[PDB]
Structure formats: structure tokens, C-alpha cells
Design a protein around this ligand. Structure first.
Ligand SMILES: [Mg+2]
Ligand SMILES: [Zn+2]
Ligand SMILES: [Zn+2]
Ligand SMILES: [Zn+2]
Lengths: 107, 112, 97, 177, 554, 87, 270, 171
DNA sequence: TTCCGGTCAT
RNA sequence: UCGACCAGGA
């Protein structure tokens, strides 16, 4: 995790995906001043083991596509750092039934 | 959280009037608009571009334009869309038709 | 009279499945055409007498179905073909799901 | 019509309908590898006359039976004995079956379900393909040439001596008249 | 539907495979050479020439013949014909792609412009979405204008690896009307502008690789890029472009039947130039005319103005136009149709009907019919209706027998006669308590259409109960309403079991009942309430008698 | 296809008959009854098919099987007999 | 538009909300699988009220002369005072109605306690009442075990989803939570005896009904919810006949279009 | 050569026959529309085996008329000649253009010029025949032919065969 | 937005 | 008899 101040040079960033398996992430200071997950509206998300996911699917008879999706650059998807394929479980409050379980895969 | 707002806003539009709509509806819509990825619009620009069949999207705002690129890209239509069948003249998989009916020859004997 | 779009949307909401079809087919268009089980088209030269059926080109005489669809639809199709676009009518799904 | 246990995905271009020859190349509907209703695989089913005469009779018979559970609620000698089994369990207008039993019963080569059994147990050690293992049973063959020539699909699949032995044991099992 | 039994099995459509016609197929299918542009008159002699419409295709004049296919008019759908063009033409609608494709592949050798070799490309080759590969691929190679022959592999940028060859510079391309033109940059300077002949484009495509097709949003079997260019033209049959006869000695030809006529003409003219005084490029002035018509025939609302107006200044109905949303085919013929067994008049309130009822005027109930099937259970009652005639009320007006034949109850020398047969149908009149779907447009509610009980009444109006007023959202200030009549024992069921007004009382759109009590009944129900309000015997008795379910207990 | 056929056990759908189902069964059965199909109940004098159906459907003497399809295509089979009919 | 954009959405037999692709759009219609039709504004008594008043109502202490059920209510009144094995269920209960309280105040921050919920319990009891001519005079005949242990046995049967596994049976609990809070809110020992003198008969009845009534309020796989929802919103849109914000109709238009440049942009910072 | 292939057929039953012994009727009809049929892809359908364990599966009710449609799966005995297949049958018809041998349910025809040469054709014979040095071919005479080719048609199958090779002719 | 006479003329 | 326009109804 690398925290830059005002910005990074377009010559540098093109050096992150050049050493797998390892992975790197770029975050701006001004964006981390406040934690978005703390916001009234943002419900808590949760990563899912490639075990817990292969489950969710089987239990609903779903194919990867039929699953609601979250953006690879989505604020929270970055907060947790998902990866194309990882599924997040979204649990929130509800004025119809206290809590509601939702799932979001990633693209 | 966007969904949360998108809904909150839509809810306000119907509330400003002194009317009432049961969550579920505005929710459902607010949801159809979100799932896909971010903010898909309820317009020929968005939703009517999804993976849905051709014949379906075909019946709204782009028709031929859409049909053309359908056979050009050799699309395949499931015929699971209400629309799909209405165009073919077949019973749509809808309530009454969300299932099949059969004569169980077996049970057809215990009855006598 | 006219069972326009909105009137449809209502029956769909109602779940009144068969009723909608009965409006759209039996009480309107409803037409019976023959197809090639091979190349999903209206090609089929049905002589419905000497039971001959053919369909030279995809050359058949054996695999032939018969379907009911709104005459308008038939037209929708023929019109599309004249625009050199091919809509295939297949009686069995092969893509699963 | 009457579909056949194998949905061959025909994608538009139906053009390759090979020939039908004793190159053991029978229509796609008769590969050595066909499918049984249970969903299993199974070798094609090759019937040599007189072996068929028995399968048919066998069902036409057991039909007349279950055709009465519900009813409540020597060569020239078998021609008459079969005509009846038809005018009882057949459509009568199945002029083919009539003519199939005559033929099937005239050119047949065995009368005992025991004799036909051995014929099979015998040829079924050849590893040959069903169609041959049929013609061999329904065609008289004195020489390996009469054989390997009226069933050219054999040619290199079995030594002439061997095939000659088999032919010996056939005329030896061939029931009299 | 259609009539006349067919030994052909019947199924429903399960999939719709969209594709493009291959000139070769178009030919095979066709049953008409279609060489002449004229319509009929074998020298004024009336009939049809082996030229256009019916050189073996469908018919007119109420005459069996449809290539012996007989059946005649109603039953014989069309039988496409074709017409061998002169020189390849674009497809008004595909031009967009055809262009976007060249920009993706270079001529001469015809192959992609970015192999697995370029990494940015890899990412664009994993995307499984015809619509998206081809939308990213294009974005990637629309820029590169040099058919690279040697590129730096997954190793050193020092070492250069080889693949396909022919660096022939790639020309950028722009769209002028119905043609494609591109400039080739020459260095040392100044451009090189030349027109890309269809004949040429078509070729480059024919040579595009098998895996190249697919990589770009295509399909080896149903849609090869090479098919976006028209070689052979399918000729929709009469039923697509019917005529209109004012008896005889006149005309009646359809718009389309003309554009073909033109396309045909403009075609022949061309041909007779390449086998005659061919001033080489005084032809491409008459080959643009073919590209034109064969374009306009399909699409006629383009950017390049020329509307292809038909003598009289009338626009010309292009095929596209026929499908274009609303008022047309897809949306106006398929998603919504006109229908039979329907009626509509003015509505008025009637405080004497139960909620779920609807007053239908004798007029109508004697007009609208319901097909009942003769059954021991009704034989009797049904035979009486038939007897009764189609003029008395409780009656019928059509008896149909197994032999698929209609007995017209108002003429048939046997009207009075007739013994029904278990199995026959007797289209009768609508009768008290025949479930019907009532409705008042605009319909934006489940409730804008509800099943009602039919109550045949005098006078000419659909008399609906008041409380079912607010759902339809109707007043009687001259408001009209539609009535539809079910047709299958099972259709009715779908109405009476899911649409019957009593059922609609509480609505999901706001988890609260959606019909109440209004005007008088409301205003009055308050007054009638007040402590101050008392009623004496004589009347309390009548009021009691009024509630039909009074237990008879004063 | 039988991998797409779910066992009577492992069954998971609603133990009760959906309003559409019954709506259709009744109709379907009514239609058949109107076609001169056999009636499995003593008609207490009834003579209307949908009326007969409603009766058949109350003594659960209707020989029909509702095959409920699932999003993925696999289905469950229920019998008017089984299905509870609240409403 | 609204319509065409949700035609294909219906509740499938699994109790999921999907479209023609099978793309789950809602895992449980409306996040509760209840058919809008069977719903009424009820009040979650457990929310509002002074922490003080909450006790005086739901608290039962069998180890206290002043905090026990007066034997004038229960039949086995005197023979309970002091029982320790019961004061465990009786405390289990209360620790729950309390967990409840905090839970709702975390969902409906507004304090608003009136919400739409299947099964109208108020009335279901109102009937229990005058159906058995219950006299607010003589004492009940409910075991404290009777009540508490039956209310617990009820929730087990309010099935929305059915599945034979954890992931599923786990949604079940979810899609019922709120309702139960209301349930426990109205079937708490103190209440059940002091407020509405129910007999064993009445209670066993009230339960049976809540179950059946509930089970009916579920949604029928088949309901074409999309079109429904569409209209339900698009309908009250026409009736829209017309503090300085963007407004109705045009605003809704603004929303469905997902327009970048909205007339009013505003933003409220607390 | 004769075969035992596993086929299936779809019958559409009118609600009328939704009786007690429906199964009975179905089967009954299966047979009406199979035994005696003919195809190019199955040839001659002769007899339905195992009449008793015929699988009917649950039939599904169509949806405009109560007619139900069951996929009756069965098994029976078929027979479809081939080109190059050798078979023997009894002659039936015999003209100046050759004779026609009857191999089972089918009729194979042999051309005058598809036989040998030493075999001419005698016209003034009763019944009509073909004479040789030591052989004589007429009506009842049994022959063994080699089917050169097959030609499917309607509800039958014809084929031309020769007796010009070796081990072919009379018996 | 949807649904539902007269005139002119091609 | 395919249409376009104008006027009008809830
Ligand atoms: Mg009005
Ligand atoms: Zn074909
Ligand atoms: Zn024809
Ligand atoms: Zn090149």
C-alpha cells in the first residue's frame, strides 16, 4: 500500500503489475482523511472465501454472471481491496425485515 | 450507499405529493438500476443495452437498429422474456405460466 | 378495438398468462406456418395434401415442424429476411441454462 | 415421426451424408456405439434371420398374453401357427410383418432358442462387428471365400482357416428340417 | 388457426438464432429467378410474367397456384425469390461496421492488426462479449496504421519476432454518403485519396481468418463479416408487398414492389454496360445508383439527405420504416394488436349493481359471442339458445361441427332444425354472469382492467358500480370504456380467479384497499350516522328489507 | 435430463399451492371437463365445468401434476393432492 | 419506460427476484418475501417509551413481592413467586426484548415505531378476545412455560424460505427478524396476561392464526413483480398535479435519466 | 442386418381419453402409428418388443385444449437394407427387364443386364422365366442377391441388386 | 402518453 | 382499399 500526497508520475504507476503474485495499491491522502465505511449510508461489506463463494453459488444455483456486481474501483471494493472474481456479502438494515443479506461479485 | 440515496431521493419525489408507495416497489426499481455495477439509467442509453435478448430490447426505442446488429453478431434469444413470447404468440412464463401441468396416469387410477 | 401495449402490461401484472395469449393469438393474428428443423426459416414448401414437405436448399422432407405465431410476426420475420437478416425459429433449446 | 435416442446438434450445414456400404459404415443411426433408454451405452443390435424370427415371435406371443390379462376386463406347420398369432396381436394391415414372418420363417436357420444361443456364444468370440456377426449367421457359407466375399468387411479380420472352422460348426448346428 | 390439418408435428419456438444471409443460401431458398422489372401484362394480357412477383412465387386473383403448393392466398405464406445483383453493394445498415472492420484489418493480406504479441490486446481478447471485444479491439487498432511484420516479443525489445507480412501502410477511413474513402500517407509527403470499391472490401473480408472472424464480434456459421456485403438480394413475396385491386382494369402496386422495380432496373442498366461500350468510369456513376436503391429500399431516413422521393414527393416506405417503433409492426402489430370479441361505449353509474358487476347492453350481448362446447350437461339449454335465434336475447348465432364448418344461425335453411352433437361448439351470446375483462384507458394499473360479472341490461351504456370507479379512474362526463370477452373455459378462469374486482379491493401498490365509498353513499353515510339522527318503524323496516342479507330480525 | 429432475425428497418449493397454479389447474381441468373428459367426483347436480373443477379440486380428486421450474432449469413436481390449498 | 425496464422481473419458485437472464435482482422480494397486499401499519411498542415505562410493562421478576405477576392474573400465581428455574426463562425473555429495543433503535433511528408488517396482530387478538368471552376478572391458566415456550415455538414456523441448509436457513432468520421483534413485543408474558387476559385456549388460538395468517402473506412465486412495481410508481406519477428544491415530475424525470447536471444540486452537511 | 433400435414417439391424447386405462389406449395407438411404418433413418419398423414395460412417463397437458402429450419411449425390431449388403429372398415378379426378389418386407429388383450373360430371357414360358445352361429362374425360385443400391420412398424401400459376382444366383 | 369524425388524394 | 392532414372526446 503506497500513500502518495498530491500525485504520482504516469511513468511510475506502470510498474505495479510487473511482479506477480505480489500486488500493489495506490491511495491518495486527501481520500483517506475520512473513512467512507463510517458513513451513515454505507452498509458493511464482507469478503468471501473462495470456499464461501463456491457455496453461495451452489446454494442458489447461480452462475457467476447472474450475481449482482460491485466495481473494481468502487470506494469500498478498494477499502477492502477485492480482486476480479471475489464476492462481497452486503448486510444492511431494512424497513421490511430488520437485516437483509445481499451479495456483490466483482468485475 | 448510492442505492440508498437513489432510493431516498425517489422516495421523496412520491412523498412530496402526499402519496405513498410500499418500499418494495421503489426498492425493486432502485435495485434494478443499481445491481449491474453502478448507475444504469432507465433509458435506451442503459438498461436497453443489457445482455437481455434482442426481440425484447427490440420493442423499445431502437428496434431495427438493434435487430440489425443482432443477426450481424449472430445473437441467440432465450425466449424467457415476457416480450419474446408475446411476439411469438406463445404463453409467457408468467404467473399462470411459471410452470407446467401434467396428468399423472398413476393417480389417474386411484380415482375411481 | 385495441389491446394496446398498456393493456398488455396489465395482464402481465395480473399474471393472466393464457388470457394475454388468447387476446394476442386466437382473438387476432394467429397463423400457422411450417419450418425447417435445420435452417430455422419459413422456406418449407408445405403441400398439406400429398403431405409432401420439402425445403430444397437445406434440402429436407423429413425434419419439419409446424408452428402457430401471430401473422404479424411471420411478416416481422419475412420483412427482416428481405433486409437480408435471418431469424432462426428452433423448436428445441440447445444452449441449456 | 419417431425420434431416436440421440439429439445430434444440427447447426445449419447438413452436408456430409456419407455412403451406405459394407465398409461397415451404416448411417449415423447405426454406429457400433449407440444409446439405450436408461441413458447407458450399448453395442448395436445385429439380428440374423431365424434369430429375429425368435425375438418377434417372442414378443408377439407375450403380447397375446398381456392382451388377455386385460381381456376379462415343422416348416409348413409354423406358417399356420404364426398367421394366427398375427390375426390376434397384430394390426392385420401390417402387411409387412406378415411378409416378414413368412420370409423370416422360411429362410430361417434355427428352431431352438438353445441352438440360436450357441450360434451366438460362438460368433461372439470373434470380436467382429455386429453386422458381420449377423450375415455369418444367416448366410450359408461353405468356403472362406464364399464368406469373406459375401461379407467383404471381414477380409482381413480373421484367418481363412479360423473362419472355415466357424463355418464348419455352423452347418453342424444348422437344425434339420 | 389456419385450418386444414398438417401431418407435421407442432412445437413452440424456443430460441431465435439471429444471423445474416449468405448469398449462396439466398439462392438455394429462392424459387424465382426474377429478371424482369415489370409486373404482369404478358403484353397487356392479364396474369403475371415469370419476371417479378410470381415467377413461381405466391399469388393474387384468388387462384390456388403457389407452385402447386396450392392452398391459395390464405395459407401460402410467401416464397422468397432472389435477384442476382451486378456488383456487390453495402447494406445500408451495416456500413457502420463494414467500415469499423476495415479499420481493424489491413487489406492485401487481410488479417488482424494486433496479435497475442501486443499485451494491451491480450486483455481485449479475454473479454467474452462480442459487443465488447469488438468495441475495445477497434479502439486499439483504429490508431495503428501500419501492418507490422516484426514486433518485440515477451522478451527483449532488442530482439524482433516475425509473424504475417506486408507492411503496406493502412489508410485511415471516413464516410462520405454510401461509400468508403481513405488516405494513404506517403513519407520522404501529401495524401493519396481513392475510393474503396465494394468488390475490393468484400474480398479483403472473404480472406479474413476463421479465428479472426470470431475474435471480432462474429460467427463462422451465422454471420461472417463477408456477408455484410450484398451479392444476392432476397425478394420478399406478395404478402409482404401486397397489391390493392379496384376490381380489375386498374393497378394497385405497393411501395416496395416499386423499389425492387427500381433496384431491378438500375441493376440491368449496369450489366448492359460491362458487356458494351464501357467507358470504364462512366459506369461507377451508374453503380452508385444500385448501391443507392438497394440501400434506400431498406433504410430511407439517412444523413445524406436525398430522400429517394417517389414521383409525387411522397417519401417512400423503406423496410426499416415498417418496424420503427410505435404505429409499426414490432410495437404496433405485435406488442399491441386490434382484437375481436370486444366492444366499447359510454359508461354511467348505477347504484343498483354489486361491485363486481357491469351492465352490458342487450345490443352488445347479442353481438359478442362465447364458444361453448356441446355437452350432455348443457345439450338441452344450448339447443334452446340456438333454436331461440340470434335476434332474441338469450340465444346464440353460430353452430360449428367437428367437420370444421360454420353453420350461420341467421341464414342456414336449417336454422330452426339442427340437433347438436356432443363435441360441437355453439357460439352463443354473452349471458348474465359471463366473466368479462372491463377497462378504461390509459391503463397504468393492474386495476385499470378488472373482471366483472356481465349483467345484460337495457339502454346503451356500460353501467358500472360506483365504488369501482376510482380504480379505473372514471367519471361519467362522457367517459368511454372497453370490454373484452374471454374464449376458453380456462381463459375465463384466469379472469375470475385473478382479475375479479372483488379481488382487487386491497392494492399492493400501497398495501391499502383501493376502492371506497363516494358522493351520495359517502355524504349520506355520514348524515345517516349522527347522534341527532333517528329513524321510525315504517322506514327502519324498508331499510332492513334492502340489505339482501338481513337475517329478518328487526 | 434426469440431472434436472429433483427428488420428491430434497424438495424445497412452497408446500402450498400458488394462486396462479390453482387458477390454472381449475381452468385447465375445467377446460378438459368441458371437453367431455372424465369427471372424478359425483356431480351433486352441477353442470358447469369450472364449477365441477372447483369441486374436483376440493376433494383433491384432480389427476394433475404441477411441475415447478427453477431459474436454472431443474424442476420440482407436485400434485394437486399434495399441495395445501389455503387461499 | 419504467415498465419496459422491468417487464421480465418476477418472483421465481426459489423466492428470489430475477429477470430473463436469471440475474438475481433481489434475493427475497422486497427484502422480506411478503406480498404487499397483506400488510398494515402496526407499531413496534418495544421501541418508543421511557426506559422506565419499558420495565413496568415487560419486566417480570418472580423473586420480588412487587415485581412478580400478582396471582390475581395467573392461576399458578402464588406457587411461582420465587421459583428460580422459571426466573431464568423469564430473564432470558427480558434480555431479549431488550436486545430487541436496541436493535430497532439501530434500524429506525427516527424513533418512528409504526411500520407496515404482515399479520395484523392487534386485531388477531381483538378477536381472540370477544371470541371466547374472556373475563378480565378471573385468573388465566397459562404456565409461564406455556407462554414463553410457545412464542418461541411460533417463530420456528413463520417460514418464508425453506431450504435444507445453512446459507438458506440463515436468510430465513434474516427475512423474519423484524416481524418477530413485533411478535415478541406483543406476546411477552406480562402483556399476554395483564393487558389481554388470554386463556390457554385463546393463546393457543392466537398463535395458530398468526402462523397461518403469516404463511398466507408470503409472496406467490409467479407474481410478475416488475411490471407491478413499475406501475405502482409510474401510476401515482400521473396523478401528480402541480422548500425550493427541484420538485416532483421533472425531478423524477431527472432521476430516471441519471442526469449529470441537475437543476438543484444542494447538499446538507451536519 | 435386422436391428433392434431404441426409439421414441410423441402422441397427443385428447382429454376425452383421460380415462382409467389411458395407458392402454396410448400403447394401442403407439402401435397404430409405428408397426408397419417406414423411414429412411430407421427403415422398416416391424414390431414393438416388450409390449408390457413400455415407458410412458408423465404426459404434459398442452395449453389451449386439454390434449396431453406423452413421449412414449419404446424398443422394437427394425430392418433397413444397405448397399453392398447381401441377402436372399424369393422372386415375385419377373419381366423382360429382370426379376424382382423379395427379401423380407422389402423388394429388391435385379436388371436383365445386371445378371450374367449365359442367362437369357424366355418369353413364351408359363410362368415367365430366365434360362441358363443348367439353371432356371422363375417365380418361387429362391435367389441370393447383392444390393447394389438403395432408394427410399413413401412407406417402403426399393433397391437394385445383382447376381453377377460369385456365390450369387440360385440355391 | 394512450385510446377513440371530416377532407384530399395518391 | 394502403395513407397524410385537420377538427374533436376521457
Ligand atoms: Mg373524464
Ligand atoms: Zn430448410
Ligand atoms: Zn405457396
Ligand atoms: Zn496486411
Amino acid at each position: 500500500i503506497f500513500v502518495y500526497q498530491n500525485n504520482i508520475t504516469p511513468s511510475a504507476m506502470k510498474l505495479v503489475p510487473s511482479i506477480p503474485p505480489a500486488t500493489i495499491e495506490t491511495f491518495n491522502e486527501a481520500a483517506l482523511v475520512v473513512n467512507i465505511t463510517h458513513h451513515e449510508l454505507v452498509p458493511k461489506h464482507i469478503r468471501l472465501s473462495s470456499d464461501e463463494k463456491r457455496e453461495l453459488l451452489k446454494r442458489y444455483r447461480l452462475k457467476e454472471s447472474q450475481l449482482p456486481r460491485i466495481q473494481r474501483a468502487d470506494p469500498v471494493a478498494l477499502y477492502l481491496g477485492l480482486k476480479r472474481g471475489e464476492v462481497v456479502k452486503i448486510i444492511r438494515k431494512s424497513e421490511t425485515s430488520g437485516r437483509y443479506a445481499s451479495y456483490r461479485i466483482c468485475m | 450507499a448510492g442505492r440508498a440515496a437513489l432510493y431516498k431521493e425517489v422516495y421523496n419525489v412520491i412523498a412530496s405529493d402526499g402519496s405513498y408507495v410500499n418500499y418494495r416497489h421503489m426498492a425493486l426499481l432502485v435495485d434494478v438500476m443499481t445491481t449491474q455495477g453502478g448507475l444504469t439509467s432507465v433509458t435506451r442509453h442503459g438498461f436497453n443495452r443489457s445482455n437481455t435478448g434482442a426481440l425484447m430490447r427490440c420493442s423499445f426505442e431502437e428496434t431495427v437498429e438493434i435487430l440489425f446488429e443482432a443477426g450481424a453478431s449472430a445473437e441467440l434469444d432465450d425466449c424467457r422474456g415476457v416480450s419474446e413470447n408475446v411476439i411469438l404468440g406463445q404463453m409467457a412464463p408468467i404467473g399462470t405460466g411459471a410452470f407446467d401441468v401434467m396428468i399423472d396416469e398413476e393417480s389417474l387410477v386411484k380415482y375411481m | 378495438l385495441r389491446f394496446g401495449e398498456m393493456e398488455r402490461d396489465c395482464m402481465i401484472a395480473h399474471g393472466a398468462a393464457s388470457f394475454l395469449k388468447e387476446r394476442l393469438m386466437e382473438a387476432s393474428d394467429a397463423f400457422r406456418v411450417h419450418i425447417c428443423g435445420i435452417c430455422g426459416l419459413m422456406t418449407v414448401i408445405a403441400k398439406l395434401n400429398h403431405n409432401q414437405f420439402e425445403c430444397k436448399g437445406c434440402d429436407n422432407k423429413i425434419d419439419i415442424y409446424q408452428i402457430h405465431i401471430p401473422y404479424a410476426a411471420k411478416l416481422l420475420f419475412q420483412e427482416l429476411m428481405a433486409m437480408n437478416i435471418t431469424p432462426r425459429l428452433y423448436t428445441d433449446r440447445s444452449r441449456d441454462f | 415421426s419417431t425420434s431416436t435416442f440421440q439429439t445430434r446438434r444440427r447447426r445449419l450445414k447438413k452436408v456430409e451424408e456419407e455412403e451406405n456400404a459394407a465398409t461397415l459404415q451404416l448411417g449415423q443411426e447405426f454406429q457400433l456405439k449407440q444409446i439405450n433408454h436408461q441413458g447407458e451405452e450399448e453395442e448395436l443390435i445385429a439380428l440374423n434371420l431365424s434369430e429375429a424370427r425368435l425375438v418377434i415371435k417372442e414378443a408377439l406371443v407375450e403380447r397375446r398374453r398381456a392382451f388377455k390379462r386385460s381381456q376379462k376386463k415343422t416348416r409348413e406347420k409354423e406358417l399356420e401357427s404364426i398367421d394366427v398369432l398375427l390375426e390376434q396381436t397384430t394390426g392385420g394391415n401390417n402387411k409387412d410383418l406378415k411378409n416378414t414372418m413368412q420370409y423370416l420363417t422360411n429362410f430361417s436357420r434355427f428352431r431352438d432358442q438353445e441352438t440360436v444361443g450357441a450360434v451366438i456364444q460362438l460368433l461372439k468370440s470373434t470380436g467382429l462387428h455386429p453386422f458381420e456377426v449377423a450375415q455369418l449367421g444367416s448366410l450359408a457359407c461353405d468356403t472362406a471365400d464364399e464368406a469373406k466375399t459375401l461379407i467383404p468387411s471381414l477380409n482381413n479380420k480373421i484367418s481363412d482357416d479360423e473362419l472355415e472352422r466357424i463355418l464348419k460348426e455352423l452347418s453342424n448346428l444348422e437344425t434339420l428340417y | 388457426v389456419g385450418q386444414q390439418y398438417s401431418s407435421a408435428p407442432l412445437r413452440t419456438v424456443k430460441e431465435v438464432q439471429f444471423g445474416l444471409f449468405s448469398p449462396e443460401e439466398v439462392r438455394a431458398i429462392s424459387v424465382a429467378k426474377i429478371r424482369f422489372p415489370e409486373t404482369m401484362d404478358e403484353t397487356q394480357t392479364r396474369a403475371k410474367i415469370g419476371g417479378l412477383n410470381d415467377p413461381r412465387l405466391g399469388s393474387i386473383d384468388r387462384n390456388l397456384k403457389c407452385q402447386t403448393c396450392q392452398e391459395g392466398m390464405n395459407e401460402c405464406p410467401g416464397h422468397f425469390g432472389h435477384i442476382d445483383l451486378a456488383k456487390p453493394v453495402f447494406h445500408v445498415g451495416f456500413i457502420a461496421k463494414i467500415k469499423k472492420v476495415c479499420e481493424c484489418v489491413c487489406m492485401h493480406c487481410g488479417k488482424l492488426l494486433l496479435d497475442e504479441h501486443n499485451e494491451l490486446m491480450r486483455q481485449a481478447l479475454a473479454i467474452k462479449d462480442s459487443k465488447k471485444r469488438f468495441a475495445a479491439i477497434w479502439t486499439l487498432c483504429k490508431t495503428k496504421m501500419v501492418c507490422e511484420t516484426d514486433v518485440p516479443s515477451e522478451d527483449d525489445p532488442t530482439q524482433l519476432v516475425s509473424r504475417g507480412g506486408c507492411g503496406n501502410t493502412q489508410p485511415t477511413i471516413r464516410k462520405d454518403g454510401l461509400k468508403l474513402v481513405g488516405s494513404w500517407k506517403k513519407d520522404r509527403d501529401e495524401p493519396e485519396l481513392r475510393v474503396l470499391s465494394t468488390e475490393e472490401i468484400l474480398n479483403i473480408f472473404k480472406h479474413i481468418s476463421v479465428k479472426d472472424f470470431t475474435s471480432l464480434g462474429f460467427n463462422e456459421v451465422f454471420s461472417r463479416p463477408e456477408w455484410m456485403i450484398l451479392t444476392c438480394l432476397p425478394v420478399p413475396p406478395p404478402p409482404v408487398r401486397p397489391s390493392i385491386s379496384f376490381n380489375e382494369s386498374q393497378r394497385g402496386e405497393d411501395d416496395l414492389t416499386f423499389k425492387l422495380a427500381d433496384i431491378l432496373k438500375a441493376n440491368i442498366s449496369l450489366e448492359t454496360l460491362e458487356h458494351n461500350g464501357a467507358p470504364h468510369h462512366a459506369i461507377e456513376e451508374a453503380e452508385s445508383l444500385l448501391q443507392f436503391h438497394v440501400a434506400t429500399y431498406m433504410d430511407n431516413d439517412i444523413a445524406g439527405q436525398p430522400q429517394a422521393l417517389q414521383k409525387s414527393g411522397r417519401p417512400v416506405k423503406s423496410i426499416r420504416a415498417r418496424l420503427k417503433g410505435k404505429e409499426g409492426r414490432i410495437r404496433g402489430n405485435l406488442m399491441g394488436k386490434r382484437v375481436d370479441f370486444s366492444a366499447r361505449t359510454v359508461i354511467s353509474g348505477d347504484p343498483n349493481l354489486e361491485l363486481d358487476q357491469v351492465g352490458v347492453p342487450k345490443s352488445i350481448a347479442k353481438t359478442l359471442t362465447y364458444p361453448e362446447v356441446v355437452t350432455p350437461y348443457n345439450i338441452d339449454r344450448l339447443t334452446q339458445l340456438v333454436r331461440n335465434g340470434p335476434n332474441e336475447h338469450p340465444g346464440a348465432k353460430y353452430v360449428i361441427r367437428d367437420s370444421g364448418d360454420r353453420i350461420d344461425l341467421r341464414y342456414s335453411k336449417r336454422a330452426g332444425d339442427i340437433q347438436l352433437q356432443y363435441g360441437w361448439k355453439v357460439e352463443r351470446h354473452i349471458m348474465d354472469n359471463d366473466p368479462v375483462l372491463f377497462n378504461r384507458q390509459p391503463s397504468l394499473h393492474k386495476m385499470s382492467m378488472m373482471a366483472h360479472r356481465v349483467k345484460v341490461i337495457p339502454y346503451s351504456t356500460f353501467r358500472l358500480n360506483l365504488s369501482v370507479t376510482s380504480p379505473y379512474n372514471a367519471d361519467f362526463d362522457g367517459d368511454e370504456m372497453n370490454l373484452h370477452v374471454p374464449q376458453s373455459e380456462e381463459t375465463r378462469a384466469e379472469l375470475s380467479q385473478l382479475c375479479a374486482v372483488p379481488l382487487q379491493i386491497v392494492s399492493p401498490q400501497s398495501n391499502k384497499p383501493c376502492m371506497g365509498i363516494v358522493q351520495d353513499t359517502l355524504c349520506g353515510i355520514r348524515k345517516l350516522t349522527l347522534r341527532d339522527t333517528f329513524i321510525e318503524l315504517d322506514q327502519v323496516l324498508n331499510m332492513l328489507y334492502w340489505v339482501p342479507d338481513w337475517d329478518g330480525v328487526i | 435430463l434426469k440431472e434436472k429432475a429433483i427428488p420428491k425428497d430434497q424438495r424445497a418449493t412452497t408446500p402450498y399451492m400458488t394462486k396462479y397454479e390453482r387458477a390454472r389447474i381449475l381452468g385447465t381441468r375445467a377446460l378438459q371437463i368441458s371437453m367431455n373428459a372424465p369427471v372424478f367426483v359425483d356431480l351433486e347436480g352441477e353442470t358447469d365445468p369450472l364449477r365441477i373443477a372447483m369441486k374436483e379440486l376440493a376433494e383433491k380428486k384432480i389427476p394433475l401434476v404441477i411441475r415447478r421450474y427453477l431459474p436454472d432449469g431443474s424442476f420440482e413436481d407436485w400434485s394437486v393432492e399434495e399441495l395445501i390449498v389455503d387461499l | 419506460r419504467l415498465v419496459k425496464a422491468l417487464e421480465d422481473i418476477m418472483v421465481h419458485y426459489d423466492n428470489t427476484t430475477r429477470n430473463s437472464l436469471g440475474n438475481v435482482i433481489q434475493f427475497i422480494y422486497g427484502e422480506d418475501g411478503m406480498d404487499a397486499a397483506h400488510i398494515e401499519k402496526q407499531s413496534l411498542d418495544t421501541i418508543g417509551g421511557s426506559d422506565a415505562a419499558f420495565e413496568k410493562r415487560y419486566r417480570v421478576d418472580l423473586l420480588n413481592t412487587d415485581h412478580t405477576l400478582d396471582p390475581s392474573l395467573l392461576e399458578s400465581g402464588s406457587e411461582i413467586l420465587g421459583d428460580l428455574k422459571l426466573q431464568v426463562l423469564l430473564d432470558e425473555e427480558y434480555k431479549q426484548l431488550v436486545k430487541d429495543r436496541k436493535f430497532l433503535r439501530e434500524v429506525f433511528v427516527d424513533g418512528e415505531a409504526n411500520w407496515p408488517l404482515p399479520v395484523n396482530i392487534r386485531r388477531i387478538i381483538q378477536n381472540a378476545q370477544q371470541t371466547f368471552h374472556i373475563d378480565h376478572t378471573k385468573p388465566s391458566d397459562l404456565t409461564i412455560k406455556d407462554i414463553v415456550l410457545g412464542v418461541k415455538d411460533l417463530q420456528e414456523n413463520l417460514l418464508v424460505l425453506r431450504g435444507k441448509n445453512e446459507i438458506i436457513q440463515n436468510a430465513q432468520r434474516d427475512a423474519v427478524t423484524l416481524f418477530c421483534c413485533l411478535l415478541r413485543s406483543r406476546l411477552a408474558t406480562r402483556r399476554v396476561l395483564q393487558e389481554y387476559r388470554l386463556t390457554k385456549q385463546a393463546f393457543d388460538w392466537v398463535l395458530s392464526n398468526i402462523e397461518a395468517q403469516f404463511l398466507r402473506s408470503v409472496v406467490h412465486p409467479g407474481e410478475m413483480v416488475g411490471v407491478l412495481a413499475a406501475q405502482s410508481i409510474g401510476e401515482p406519477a400521473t396523478q401528480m398535479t402541480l422548500k425550493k428544491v427541484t420538485s416532483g415530475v421533472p425531478r423524477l424525470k431527472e432521476i430516471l435519466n441519471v442526469a449529470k447536471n441537475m437543476k438543484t444540486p444542494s447538499l446538507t452537511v451536519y | 442386418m435386422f436391428f433392434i433400435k431404441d426409439l421414441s414417439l410423441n402422441i397427443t391424447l385428447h382429454p376425452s381419453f383421460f380415462g382409467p386405462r389411458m395407458k392402454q389406449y396410448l400403447k394401442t395407438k403407439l402401435l397404430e402409428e409405428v408397426e408397419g411404418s417406414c423411414t429412411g433413418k430407421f427403415g422398416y419398423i416391424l414390431c414393438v418388443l416388450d409390449y408390457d414395460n413400455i415407458d410412458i412417463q408423465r404426459g404434459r397437458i398442452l395449453p389451449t385444449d386439454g390434449s396431453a402429450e406423452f413421449n412414449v419411449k419404446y424398443r422394437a425390431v427394425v430392418f433397413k437394407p444397405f448397399k453392398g449388403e447381401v441377402v436372399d429372398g424369393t422372386v415375385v415378379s419377373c419381366s423382360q427387364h429382370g426379376f424382382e426378389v423379395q427379401v423380407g418386407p422389402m423388394k429388391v429388383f435385379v436388371t436383365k443386364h445386371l445378371m450374367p450373360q449365359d442367362l437369357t430371357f424366355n418369353a413364351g414360358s408359363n410362368p415367365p422365366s430366365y434360362q441358363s445352361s443348367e439353371d432356371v429362374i422363375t417365380i418361387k425360385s429362391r435367389i441370393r442377391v447383392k444390393i447394389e443400391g438403395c432408394i427410399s420412398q413413401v412407406s417402403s424401400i426399393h433397391a437394385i441388386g445383382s447376381i453377377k459376382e460369385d456365390y450369387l444366383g440360385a440355391i
